[PDB]
Write an enzyme that holds these catalytic residues in place. Structure first.
Site, PDB file in Angstrom:
ATOM      1  N   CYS A 181      27.170  14.683  65.495  1.00 30.50           N
ATOM      2  CA  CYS A 181      27.518  14.272  66.847  1.00 30.50           C
ATOM      3  C   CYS A 181      27.015  12.859  67.118  1.00 30.50           C
ATOM      4  O   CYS A 181      25.964  12.448  66.621  1.00 30.50           O
ATOM      5  CB  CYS A 181      26.964  15.260  67.868  1.00 30.50           C
ATOM      6  N   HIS A 231      24.591  16.285  75.206  1.00 31.36           N
ATOM      7  CA  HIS A 231      24.064  17.582  74.770  1.00 31.36           C
ATOM      8  C   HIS A 231      22.828  17.456  73.869  1.00 31.36           C
ATOM      9  O   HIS A 231      22.241  18.470  73.474  1.00 31.36           O
ATOM     10  CB  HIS A 231      25.147  18.457  74.119  1.00 31.36           C
ATOM     11  N   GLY A 272      24.543  17.724  63.385  1.00 28.08           N
ATOM     12  CA  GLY A 272      23.866  16.457  63.245  1.00 28.08           C
ATOM     13  C   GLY A 272      24.859  15.324  63.170  1.00 28.08           C
ATOM     14  O   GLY A 272      24.470  14.170  63.092  1.00 28.08           O
TER      15      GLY A 272
END
Lengths: 304, 304
Positions: free
Chosen positions: B145, B41, B143
């Site tokens: 991830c 993503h 942030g």
């Protein structure tokens, strides 16, 4: 979202943990530059730990009686001094993984991460608070001594604790990195009990703000209070008195959440008087006091 | 003595965390050998995330649209593949701090340490349990991830989790390092809810044994029970049924402490029915289920 008892990354500290062995007794040491720091009771046998004379014990020691070892590699000791309750062994190799560091003396209520080691090898890392009664409640066993407590500000590692002993109450005591004990404790096995353990209060408030930031509001009320009427109640429940300095410290979290500190104090007052009545806050059924305002702000705003 | 929710040393993992940036969106990646793994993503904008078609989105992406960075030093991307919900970016430099590692898929009830990062930089480390409903309850913010979950067996780092999203219930979801989600979740922002979460009963038992090993015995009783009569009660309190396999697993701790598993089950039954009535266990006022039997044995016997 979500809030957990998070500890600092332990990588920089891992690079400094070595094994120190004197005769039969083994424990961990901290290797910064060309100096190894460790608890002085390394030089004791089990026999004389009742009340050892460290000055006399050290006279009969030489450089070669200390075996310092960085994992697989041996370190040559080329000098040794006793500084308070710690030994400073000079080795002939400077640790090249020595980070920017400071030695600091923390205050009760302030927190730090502990990297628990055995035979100069990491076991794990957890967060602690220096208790009002100058103990900590961690996980240590034999071999743990010389495990250090610390904080990190960007590049700099602030070492604030080195582990020395466990009191019969099941709580732990140690020194700063200059070998000076926190509290009235000493590195010998006498029946030294710990003083009354009180609740940090400002930390409980910070943690209630953390709770609000992460979607818990059930404990909030339409009530407010005065510092005086709060403290009258808080003392009854073995809580540190809250000062104007504490209120100042809670400013950022109060402003962020838009909940006045004295409103939050009122909520804490209700919580203490009536309990939680079966409900939980951030997955706890009693009020947590080992998170500082800086801890909450750090975690909640993703500081590295 | 003492028993904390300790988390594995994060040093070996720290050496592998890099920053990956695609256009505006930035997140963390894992750099093992000459390969960088990260949540796919990364290629989405804010709008895209409602329901992104990753194949279509990847059409317009090239090697150079991915900016990988190991701290201060830049990494040249020389290839990229989408493997399930993760990107495998091939870089032209092999990470020399790449540890011995394995990629593993954990089961519900099993635990691991998470190293929460932002802009390829460590923030902190905490321990998690993979919940029965295939979520975890950690601390993640934007942030975060590409932050990974892991365990350590001596030299080897077993990566088991990479963070992807937070569900509206305030709980977290992610994949293994092959990019396959835990549970029925997907890397898109739809109202895809998680199943009802139960309590990991066997873990609660392990933790009660930890309690006994570390000087808590107040909850022990003169009662015992059957698996069937236990499970009838446990079901009422949203607890996993306990099987003979669970009982087998608890053997070592039962034998060490000399308390039969079914006696401990009886004590847990009393605890659930009557609460703790003002007392605590290892400094908790509700029953902890994020410690495995192996966790307790590890901590209590000082494994490195």
């Amino acid at each position: 979202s979500g809030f957990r008892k998070m500890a600092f990354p332990s990588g920089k500290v891992e690079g400094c943990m070595v094994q120190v062995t004197c005769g039969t007794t083994t424990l961990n040491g901290l290797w910064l530059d060309d100096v190894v720091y460790c608890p002085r009771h390394v030089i004791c046998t089990s026999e004389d730990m009742l009340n050892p004379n460290y000055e006399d014990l050290l006279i009969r020691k030489s450089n070669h009686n200390f075996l310092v070892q960085a994992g697989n590699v041996q370190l040559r000791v080329i000098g040794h001094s006793m500084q308070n309750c710690v030994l400073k062994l000079k080795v002939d190799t400077a640790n090249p993984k020595t980070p920017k560091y400071k030695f600091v003396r923390i205050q009760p209520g302030q927190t730090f991460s502990v990297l628990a080691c055995y035979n100069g090898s990491p076991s794990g890392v957890y967060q602690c608070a220096m208790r009002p009664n100058f103990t900590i409640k961690g996980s240590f066993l034999n071999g743990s001594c010389g495990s250090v407590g610390f904080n990190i500000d960007y590049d700099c590692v602030s070492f604030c604790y080195m582990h020395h002993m466990e009191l019969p109450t099941g709580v732990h005591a140690g020194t700063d990195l200059e070998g000076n004990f926190y509290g009235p404790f000493v590195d010998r096995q006498t029946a030294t009990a710990a003083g009354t353990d009180t609740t940090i209060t400002v930390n409980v408030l910070a943690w209630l703000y953390a709770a609000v930031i992460n979607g818990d509001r059930w404990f909030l009320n339409r009530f407010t209070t005065t510092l005086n009427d709060f403290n009258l109640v808080a003392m009854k429940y073995n809580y540190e008195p809250l000062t104007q300095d504490h209120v100042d410290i809670l400013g950022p979290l109060s402003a962020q959440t838009g909940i006045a500190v004295l409103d939050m104090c009122a909520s804490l007052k209700e919580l203490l008087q009536n309990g939680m009545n079966g409900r939980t806050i951030l997955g706890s059924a009693l009020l947590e006091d080992e998170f500082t305002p800086f801890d909450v702000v750090r975690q909640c705003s993703g500081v590295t």
